Amino acid sequence: MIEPKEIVDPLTPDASESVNNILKQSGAWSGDDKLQKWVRVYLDRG
Amino acid sequence: LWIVDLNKSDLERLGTSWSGSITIGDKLGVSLNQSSISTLDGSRFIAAVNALEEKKQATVVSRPVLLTQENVPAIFDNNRTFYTKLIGERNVALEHVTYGTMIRVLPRFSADGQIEMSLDIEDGNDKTPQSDTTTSVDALPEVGRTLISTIARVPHGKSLLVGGYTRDANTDTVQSIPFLGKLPLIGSLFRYSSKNKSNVVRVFMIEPKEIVDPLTPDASESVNNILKQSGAWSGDDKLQKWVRVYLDRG
Amino acid sequence: LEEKKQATVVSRPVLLTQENVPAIFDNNRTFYTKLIGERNVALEHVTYGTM
Amino acid sequence: IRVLPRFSADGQIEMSLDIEDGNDKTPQSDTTTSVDALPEVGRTLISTIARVPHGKSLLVGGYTRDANTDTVQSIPFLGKLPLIGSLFRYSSKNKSNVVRVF
Amino acid sequence: LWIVDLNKSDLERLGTSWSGSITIGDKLGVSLNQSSISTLDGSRFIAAVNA
């Protein structure tokens, strides 16, 4: 089968809230660590 | 960009399957299910039951980051090899999967503030027939190869999808004996049922952002918080400081 | 011997472009399944390609 | 690493970067701690011009990864009775999470 | 330039997995999990635990 659709809008909600609902529920969240947060924090908010 | 994978599968196997032969007085030989009498004369008929089931679930989320100027190309690619510990040190073996990634882009600015880019991306492992033992494939999940070739524009600081793949599947079979598999008392001792079900999504996202500022705090304070807490700091040594000090402050 | 077999599989790719520009998507996963036995060891596998 | 730098007017530096780092893919270190001794880092390659103000530090590219794995292998009938039903399980979790940035 | 790496992993493995076969009076043979009787007649069923 086939079906296209037109798209003009960004994703709602945002992608940074999608994966942070994945990683805190699949059991792989990695922001608690006080050894690795010193270099992820350069990398999440700019 | 955001790679993301979700895998989920369960499988069950239960039932018997019979074979073998009998004999009567060296005058007649009755065999069940292709058991040749030319290899067996008194070996009576046997059975085989299978019982095993499991539930598998695995996720993997990876992301590359890279910056350019506008109207200039750039390439990023990467491939690590992930090992896992097969059980045994003298009875020795390993198994390993390479995990490759590639991305090249060509961005520009618009008038109203949105970014337009030009994407070829790749991700996956190479097809390797390996990990022969049952949990050896279970250790490291597999993700297939993929390739996009797409220009796509997106408003400032927000996230748009660029392509994906989903898949759902079942399987059902009931293998049995024709006459004796329907009587109510022990008729379900002659079944052989094996369901199977897996369902997998995988999608590539994208989001750019504009950047004008240097990193806050500085990088020399980042690694000096790493090395004094991971336990590898090397400024205490009175034999090696005489040449690192030419090298930290100019 | 007799049996009854039934199987379904439903898959979908998604992708976007602009208008009047080409684009390619292709994919191939390999699906393993657990043959019964760990020391009596064997596997079997099927690649599933899409373009 | 190869580069090609120049000065700007206001004091910032603009450079031209191709860098590489890693080991070559070697199937080796067969014993269990032999891989554990020396860690592995994958190959990487950048091709990027990037400018940065004087004396401060800017990021040029990186890679992170998170993963799980869960499986519960058991016997269908006898794996649910309360008394010794958990003697027929086979559970094996797995979890790794790795960052790396230039 | 500054290379930096952080790696972290943990892994656990626990449980059993069974196999083997029995016999009754040289008249019938019941086997669990692909144990062929064509290699074994009196070798009773075994287990394997990993921890």
Author numbering:
A (entry chain O): 512 to 557
B (entry chain N): 308 to 557
C (entry chain O): 359 to 409
D (entry chain M): 410 to 511
E (entry chain M): 308 to 358
From the paper:
The injectisome is a specialized bacterial organelle that utilizes a type III secretion system (T3SS) to translocate effector proteins from the bacterial cytosol directly into a eukaryotic host. Composed of >20 different proteins, the injectisome forms a syringe shaped nanomachine that spans both bacterial membranes and that of the infected host. The major structural unit of the injectisome is the basal body, composed of three highly oligomerized concentric rings spanning the bacterial inner membrane (IM) (PrgH and PrgK in the Salmonella enterica serovar Typhimurium SPI-1 T3SS)3–6 and outer membrane (OM)7 (InvG, a member of the secretin family of OM pores also found in the type II secretion system, type IV pili system, as well as the phage assembly system). To address this and further elucidate the structural basis for injectisome assembly and function, including that of the central needle component, we have conducted here a cryo-EM analysis of the assembled native needle complex resulting in 3D reconstructions of the IM and OM rings at resolutions permitting atomic model building (3.6 Å and 3.9 Å, respectively) and the 3D reconstruction of an isolated helical needle filament at 3.3 Å resolution.
Although the more peripheral N-terminal N0 and N1 domains were of lower local resolution, the map was of sufficient quality to reveal secondary structure elements for the N1 domain in particular allowing us to position 15 copies of our prior InvG34–173 crystal structure for that domain (PDB 4G085) further expanding the defined model of the injectisome. The final secretin model spanning all domains (residues 34–557, N3 domain loop 228–251 disordered) was refined with density restrained symmetry refinement in Rosetta and notably reveals the dramatic conformational changes involved in secretin gate opening during needle assembly, a fundamental and functionally critical aspect of this giant gated pore family. Overlay of the needle complex and prior closed basal body reconstructions illustrates that the primary sites of conformational change upon needle assembly are in the conserved core secretin region: the N3 ring domain—the tightly oligomerized foundation upon which the secretin assembles7—and the inner β-barrel and membrane associating lip of the central secretin domain, all of which have reoriented to accommodate the presence of the needle filament.
